[PDB]
Symmetry: D2
Subunit: 278 residues, 4 copies
């Protein structure tokens, strides 16, 4: 294939591939490129059949499946629609679950000519760019990730530094959208450290920004990336997505116990957040 | 009386007063001193009778009353008891449409050290802002709210309150109960409130009081914040009467409320945990 | 602004557009006028495949916008053509030379040697940064100025500019502060200034207001320095070399300030609320 | 585990500070001094009221019981007795002279002229600041050092000290950074250092860790500079004058650092995440 990296950190556009009837050997090459580049982009795949899209995702693992919008007859193929909302926050998908997805395949099938880019960030570089004392600290910490909305209540505890199962490389595994707090620190220390990590981890030297064209497919490794959907458009935007499951996140056993507050202790954040959203 | 200011900003201890049978004229002098000093301290009032305490508070206005812990037989005398703590800067109940105008608190049991209370002067917090920022705040309001089981209340108050008696302008936001400024978007609101909260509780604007059993504090909740230091494990018990008055008043806002778009999500710029303790 | 003469591919909604079907070497007056309209519309424009552009043509092109800056490594025999060379980087959001009373009105940059990936440049739209502020905050900023400064050996300069400037050619208002060179807002005390500028710097470089350009062989970027910031991503180790011409002549103008400068008292000390180290690298 | 029963002692807060009654410094005995020194180890700052008229010779002899005294404005004929004068202020949390390799052990200060209210001094307990950190963070800090520095006309000094020092006389660990003079943590990059120090500065001066002293006529404060910060409240306009003796001799000591100094790459630029102005007052 013809491979054109987007940035030094991550991302590559792959020309010369046809997903519809991809061979097992050509798939192995895509998998190798995904381990190298973390998110890959396959242009010009308009018309990709539902059965082929599902078979492709299933090469990676079991697919998430019917209370959410999906293609007729294919609970595996989720519909993302701007009119149904938008996610301008850095996140790693569903890390509030005990077993977050290991990756996704997304194709924007309707969208504006400009606007609605998606950015991804390289969590290997976010960890490696920390100085050695902080890497050593984070290796021994875990964090609670959680969500609390109508119809979905979930929390999970994950290592702050995840060992990728295939590469063995260590990646930061916190994200602003779903991480609540570091379990072995008090909440105020947690807020200060997470605030630094969130901003550092999404430095432009660690990211790439993709402009969607008709027919473009993005495949990303959700074990070692965050992503961000830019909210700079008003046109209708629709995507088809398949979501892949795998093993639970793994890292070092924590080197300290959970922080234990005293009875009646009140968390007073050092930084203001409003009590009412919109 | 013998009046000893605690700091330049606010606070004064008053000797030579006995609250139990205080005269109307001596009460008028206490009120004058409260408008001058914002919080006043009256030592050595052990044994103050419930009837006299209630009568004293009622000189200032209607008293709050029974779901709260209170002295048996006297729903107007609230109980602050460590075994039943508030280490956050706050102005009392500003999530209410009509927050109290002040309180009278007597620590009757407490440790020899630990458990101080601090107050801050919200006149000086406003006056210490530069002119462009004072002008901005004069035209803003803020939503104050609380959302707990059994108590859901919000209220919209001017960011700059005009004290009814002095006519002097005071900042009227506080970290405990203020949610957001209504005419700004939430992110702008967070940034401005963060600055105001820290500036308003600068040591140059505060006083710190060490309680001796029997001491009484009287404060004007229209123009102060306060903070209960959580540095003790011994039993601490206070008796409190809480006074009501008029709704907070300031300028009509100079802009409409900020209106988000239908799908808009608030993404804070600064981390707060999703789980408390 | 009507811009129908060329094939135009916008990069993001906020700003940026790649212009096809134009050759800079022998550009006509009509085609230049269209490029200038595209710059007023899109704030930064990208002209691909201009390898070999002659020095005389590059200078004549720049001079169609205004007087060129002369001095700062430059192409031998052409003081007007400045050299940006990685061997001899700027990963901080900035608007060029705003510590000067007359910052440049824009630049033309061509990366002639660079890596196949790495070294992107981002730009931000200061019109949108201002328009995205709520009305009370726009009203406040309209009446404020800020000091921009630099103090290094051989270059000490400061200038006071409106926080909100009008673009002279469009009449539209834009934010005019940037993290690299703005020091403080003149009518606030320093602590208030720090808090408000910190908010503005991050808000103004939100991804909804930016574009990110990957340089390819022969690419030329032209940007309006009056209403943008930009940022050079520092994610590469290969040699990177650009030729730049800089158009002089901006005079940032806005409303008369509505308050006097903040006046400290004798002996007053600035204590920042947020830590910065006392030693850099 | 220090017994201090000889005098009447009135602690100021749970964290630190105690007012000592029934002792006259002028002709203090060896036994009474030993008790005051125990009270200082226990309470970190002690206050001796009603000592108007304390003679210069007795003040110096008292200081010398603790160690060698520092020897610019000073009492005539007594270079050891420094004059502090509001007309010739410091509303910033600081530990004295930590930019020096050997900061002072402690000081003895008497405000001899001042307002009836205004000009309080606060102290903070750096043992409690460290002990209040969670175990992972205490473990991190135990292995770090920080550069402390000052760069003013006539005084350029820097020193590297453990972030966590052991008090040589109690064996207890205390935080050893302060906002005024600490620059950066040496084993972190500057941005990480800024974030961690900002948290520590605010946490370490929490009201639960401090005391606030109102000076009265004749008041003497004695503090241990090894395990405190302090802060002079700037809420007064009248003349305020103090007499101060400074005890030299500290060598802040802690664990061997567990990591090397952070090494930037050539040409690396420090870009703070938080704004500070470029110009003070
Ligand atoms: Na996502
Ligand atoms: Na209260
Ligand atoms: Na530039
Ligand atoms: Na000092």
């Amino acid at each position: 294939f013809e491979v054109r990296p987007l940035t030094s950190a991550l991302g590559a556009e792959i020309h010369g591939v046809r997903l519809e009837d991809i061979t097992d050997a050509d798939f192995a090459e895509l998998r190798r490129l995904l381990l190298k580049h973390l998110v890959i982009f396959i242009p010009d795949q308009e018309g990709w059949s539902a059965e082929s899209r599902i078979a492709f995702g299933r090469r990676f693992g079991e697919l998430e499946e019917a209370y959410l919008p999906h293609l007729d007859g294919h609970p595996q193929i989720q519909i993302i629609d701007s009119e149904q909302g938008k996610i301008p926050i850095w996140h790693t998908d569903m890390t509030y679950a005990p077993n977050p997805p290991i990756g996704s395949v997304l194709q924007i099938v309707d969208g504006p000519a400009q606007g609605g880019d998606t950015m991804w960030s390289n969590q290997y570089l976010a960890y490696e760019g920390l100085s050695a004392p902080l890497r050593d600290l984070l290796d021994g910490l875990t964090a609670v990730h959680s969500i609390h909305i109508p119809g979905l209540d979930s929390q999970a505890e994950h290592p702050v530094v995840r060992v990728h199962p295939e590469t063995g490389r260590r990646a930061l595994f916190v994200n602003r959208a779903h991480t609540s707090h570091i379990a072995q620190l008090n909440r105020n220390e947690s807020d200060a450290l997470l605030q630094y990590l969130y901003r550092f981890s999404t430095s432009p030297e660690f990211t790439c920004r993709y402009q969607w064209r008709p027919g473009s497919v993005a495949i990303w490794d959700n074990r070692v990336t965050q992503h961000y959907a830019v909210d700079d458009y008003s046109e209708h935007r629709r995507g088809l997505r398949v979501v892949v499951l795998g093993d639970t996140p793994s890292g070092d056993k924590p080197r300290w116990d959970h922080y234990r507050p005293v009875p009646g202790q009140r968390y007073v954040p050092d930084w203001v957040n409003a009590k009412e959203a919109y």
